[PDB]
Structure formats: structure tokens, C-alpha cells
Amino acid sequence: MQIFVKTLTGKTITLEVEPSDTIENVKAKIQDKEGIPPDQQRLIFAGKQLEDGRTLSDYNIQKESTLHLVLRLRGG
Amino acid sequence: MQIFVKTLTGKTITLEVEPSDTIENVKAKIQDKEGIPPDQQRLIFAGKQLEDGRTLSDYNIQKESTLHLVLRLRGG
Amino acid sequence: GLPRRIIKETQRLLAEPVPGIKAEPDESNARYFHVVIAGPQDSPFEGGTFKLELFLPEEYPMAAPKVRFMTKIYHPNVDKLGRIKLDILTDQWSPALQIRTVLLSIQALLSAPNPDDPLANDVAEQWKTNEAQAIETARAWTRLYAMN
Amino acid sequence: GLPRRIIKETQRLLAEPVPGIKAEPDESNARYFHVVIAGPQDSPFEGGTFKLELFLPEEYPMAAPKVRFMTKIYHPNVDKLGRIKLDILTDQWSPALQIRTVLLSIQALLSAPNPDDPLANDVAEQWKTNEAQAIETARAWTRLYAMN
Amino acid sequence: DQQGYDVEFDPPLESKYECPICLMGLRSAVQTPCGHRFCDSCIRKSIRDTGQKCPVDNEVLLEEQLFPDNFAKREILSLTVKCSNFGCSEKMELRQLEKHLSQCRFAL
């Protein structure tokens, strides 16, 4: 399936994955295109920060579902 | 009118000029695209080395006429 | 004559809106933004609509935008005046980041409250000591102050 | 197994030929090339067809290809053995240059003979002292040796 | 003061030739070690104001580590653009814009 990923600048990219893929797997694919290391990325979907452990099927990310890219979030 | 210009590698580019344009004018347009200074370029058409002074109408270069690019030619 | 990033960044954000988040500039001042973030799914704030006021300073994009809630919200990382304890705004900013990304991070903050780095200390104390109580408190604060 | 530049460079040259110049590789050796350059317009060699033999050395493209005429030609920059006094081959070579460009430069050399940097000294002396005689001599040398 | 190239590209400017800081065509393009493009002025402002790091991934970036993407510059300057003046319909390469903008018949 396809998934949309809106980058920092506002530009969109489209990846190819299955629902079995992890969030660590998707962050590794985003590294290949944009050149941002996976630990530095923070992905948002439906106002929920997607963490490395779970898969796309757990959060319920379907065909043509638009993710959002955010920079590293540490201390307040 | 259009004119085809075959580069050193074999790749072609197409410029926009009139017959009134000089060879110095065309070499300046080839500098803009490829980043080769005009003095370093040597243009060939019908087995004839095209020199800076004359125009395209003198050599009789028409619509969609294919030129060829060659490197600097000094001493033998 | 505004800086021409802001004029493009307004147009991109307005033309391609984020799901849940409304945002428009003030008619008398383009640097002020009428923001209204909807409450995220499966949170204490499920089915609420919270106002915010975002401001772009003089040296934007090199300085981060100042954001404050304009609605009462029971959240450990938001104080009673409305100001937000979020990492994008209190340090480590970069000009690559945009208004769109800030509002997404504020939206994400509502689903993931962090008492371990607090701002409202009474709320952060309440969240750690009795979590299920504080979530029900925030659900009531949504119904009182944040539903219409 | 040849170097895979040569295999592409043969295909490009063969698929997209240069007007006037025929070129094909030898069937038993891909480094040898059967070249036949046609004589250019408004020159001493107008309406001739001259054979050449081009060879690609071991460290091509870092070394220039060795080219020699296989037809008698009255030209100051070509000796009686057939070897050519052209600048691409005797110095200042770069691997960017290809077989296609070498044959174009040899084609261009026929229209513009230069006695001031000679190889055949008897021809170069003849060209400077009596130019109109030498052009008529070359026109006869074309008809004798280079028409079919 | 100096941002990127501000003009309507035709076809529209691709994101790969766009500056992350000013959101416009890369004026005097420069590339980082981590390997993305900015304007000359904009990235140096991000270093001088915001800090010695690449905006998009927080990698290490000194002011000296930058180098000009002259390959990218030549591509951008040859992209076709529309006249920025209100009413003018003519089109040209970006390199020829500044010349035509003096020659343009619609400017204030």
C-alpha cells in the first residue's frame, strides 16, 4: 500500500509499505529519501505521536493515509 | 528558431536563437547551460569549425540543425 | 509589506489545512493567528475545541513563534494563564520548522501529557498521584470550558 | 569482457551516426574500428571517401585513441604513412572526450589545413609557397586515391 | 536582507530547488555535508542567529563546511518563469528575468 508523509517544509512524499511494517521500519525509509536519521524523526497521525515499537496496523494506518514529520522532541 | 547542440558526452541540448546571432553569442548561451567558458568551446557543423566572428546565417544554420561540441584545440 | 515567507506559509497552511486544526490570520495584523485546535481521539479531551493565539515575532523564522491557549484546559504542560511547556518553543528551534508543525506538536501534546517535566505544578502532582482522577477532571474541564 | 564504457560508446555511435562519417567495430576485435570519413564540403577533398583505422588502447579512456589514415591524402597535417598531426591525440587529452568527437575533429581538420604546425614537410612547404597549386594537387589526389 | 528568487515558475518550482528557510528558489545555492541545499545568506543566518547546525536534522554544521552547488545553480537559472509585474504575460528563463524587468512595460 501507499502512505503520504508530509515533510518539515510542507512537501509530501509517498512510500511503499505493508501494515506489518514497524514505525522503526518507516523511519528508516524516510531516512533514505530525505537524509534525516531515524532517532531525530517524530511522526504524527490523528494527533498521536507514533513510537518505534508498534506497527502501522496497530495505529490503523490505511492506504493513502497522510502522516506528518516533526523534528526531535526532548526537554521542555 | 531551434538548434540542436550535441555535447562532449553525447547528450543533446536545444537553444533558442535567430540567424542574426553570432557564434560568440551561441557559445555564450552554451556557457549558461553547461558551464564551459566560450574560449574553450569549438563548434562543428558539416565538418567546418565555426569561428567567433561570423553569424549563423553566414554558415547557413537552419531550424533544427545539429551542431557538435569539441574541447579547446591549440597545438599539434 | 510582510516578509514573503509568511505570505507563502499562510497560503500553504490555509489552502491545505490540517485535519482537526483550524487556523487563519487576523485581518488587521497578519502576524497574529486565530487558531482553534480540536481535541484528539482517545484522550481526556475527546470531542473538545480549544482556541489558541499564535504570534510571529519580528525575526521569524529565526525566532520561534509565541503560542498561548485561549481556553481553560486541565493539562500538566499548560499553565493557568494558557502558556505552553513544549520543547519547540522553549529551546532548540530551527528556521526549517513552520507554523503547521508547531500546531501539530501542540495537538500531539494533548494526547501525551508529561508530568515529569511540568508547568502547572498542582496539575502535574494530581496526574502522578491519582492519574484516573486527573483524566476525569480534564474530561469535565473539556465539557465545561471546551464544548462550544 | 570489454570495458563497459566502450560497449555503450559503440552502441551510441552506431545507433546515432554522424553525417558523413561511417564507423563500425572489427568483428574479431572490438577495440579496432573500421572508420570511413567522407570528404567535407567546399574543400580540396570535396566528394571523396577516406578510410581510417582507429584503435582503443588498454587504459582507454585515460589514454587517447590511436588513429591513422588508410588512404593516400595530400594534406600538410597528415604524413605519408597516414598518421595525423591533430591536437586531441598528441597532447591535452581528457577522458570526457569520446570516439565521436575525435572523428569530428579529423573531419574538421580536412576543411582547415594548417601548414604552420606541419607533419608532411614537403606538403606544408608546397601549401605556403603555392597554395592554389597544392589545393589542385589535393583535388587530384582525391580523384586518384579517394573516389571509390 | 537578500532572500531567494521570488517569482512564479512555470511549471511550478519543484521542492528540490526550494530553500527550506525562505521557501523560494535557491539564490546562490550551497550544499551541506549532510547534503541539502540552501541559499548562501539564509543558512549563514541560521548559523549566526539560531546556531551551528543543519536546520532540517540538527546535524553538525560550521560556516566553513558549506560549499556551492554550482550544478544546481545552473539548472535553476535555466528554469522558465513568468513576468512578476501585474498584467505582463511573457515568459523567459530565470537568468533573463532581471534584464527583462528593466525592459518590462508594466512596472510601477
Add this chain to the structure above:
Amino acid sequence: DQQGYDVEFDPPLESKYECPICLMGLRSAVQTPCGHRFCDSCIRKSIRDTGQKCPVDNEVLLEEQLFPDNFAKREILSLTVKCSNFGCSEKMELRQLEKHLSQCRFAL
């Protein structure tokens, strides 16, 4: 020994991602000060064998003056390619080729 990427691109490899020396995809791309792209090995061979100059225009070029076009590298690696083995019809990004070439069902 090491040339560029040798494989049938689909669509065909654009000239801007092609090496002037080996005539193939730019393996570990590097850009000059004068501003054109080569492989890492190929341009250094042209310096070491042929001389300290840029092949296409004879400009000055030391071995240290080169720098990696990492922006170009990421673009090239994401271009779609066909399986080089005789008979195989499958397609993929260039980055995924080496992985699939071990997994391929048609190799000798």
C-alpha cells in the same frame, strides 16, 4: 576497478545523473568547484593519470577541491531500475538492487 552503477534504469537514466568518464549512474557522486558531477574513483583517476583538471572544460582541479554531492546521491539511489539478470522482469529502487541480486532467481 570500480566504475559507476551499471543497470537499465526505468525510465532511462537522465544525463544529469550520468558520469562523463564511465557513462553510467554516479556511484558515490562528487561535484567540482566549476560544478559538475563524477564518480569518486573516476575523477581521481582522471587527476592521477590524465592531470589535475576538470575533464569537460580544462579548469583547475586539485584532488582536495572535490566534495560529495550527497543531495544527488540520495536522488540517484531512489530511481527505479530493472533486474540486470537475463529473464527477470521485476523492478525496484537502485538502493534495493544489491539485496535483490542475491535473492534473484535467474543469476548464474
